[PDB]
């Protein structure tokens, strides 16, 4: 799924993925869209720093908690501090090392110093046509799924 994002073997990775869905449905993913016009996953650009922090009882919690609502509360409404952080997480014309350093500076000030970093990861966007084809192709071959939350 990562190589399907782009690079020397993107075509092979994409071929493997569309074959995998066709194996699920008995063929026909191709009746919904062209995978060579619509690559399966696009890059999100800003990559992911993973890690965890300890809470007040010493439990491990995901560092991703300082998300947009998280960061706004962490700065207690200081929008300028928020926007500096937010730009760090969005402007990807900025070399990732510079962004990583500022992201770590922000965790020490807002999350705390009890922060451990773990293996990093990529993020990408699933092509809306891949999604249409996967969901409809399964439903279209009769593998009906009921919603348990029938109304809210």
């Amino acid at each position: 799924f990562i190589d399907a994002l782009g690079g020397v073997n993107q075509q092979r990775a994409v071929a493997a993925i569309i074959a995998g869905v066709n194996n699920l449905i008995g063929g026909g993913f191709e009746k919904f869209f062209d995978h060579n016009t619509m690559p399966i996953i696009q890059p999100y650009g800003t990559d992911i720093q993973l890690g965890y922090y300890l809470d007040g009882e010493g439990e491990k919690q995901d560092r991703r908690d300082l998300d947009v609502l998280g960061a706004l509360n962490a700065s207690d409404g200081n929008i300028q501090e928020w926007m500096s952080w937010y730009g760090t997480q969005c402007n990807v014309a900025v070399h990732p090392e510079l962004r990583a350093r500022q992201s770590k500076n922000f965790d020490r000030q807002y999350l705390g110093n009890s922060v451990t970093y773990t293996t990093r990861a990529h993020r990408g966007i699933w092509n809306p046509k891949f999604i249409e084809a996967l969901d409809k192709a399964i439903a279209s071959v009769g593998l009906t799924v009921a919603m348990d939350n029938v109304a809210q």
């Binding site: 073997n9 990775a13 493997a16």
Partner: peptide
């Protein structure tokens, strides 16, 4: 901006 590729296998 670019995608590096490591030595994946089985699917290619």
């Amino acid at each position: 901006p670019q995608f590096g590729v490591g030595q994946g296998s089985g699917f290619y």
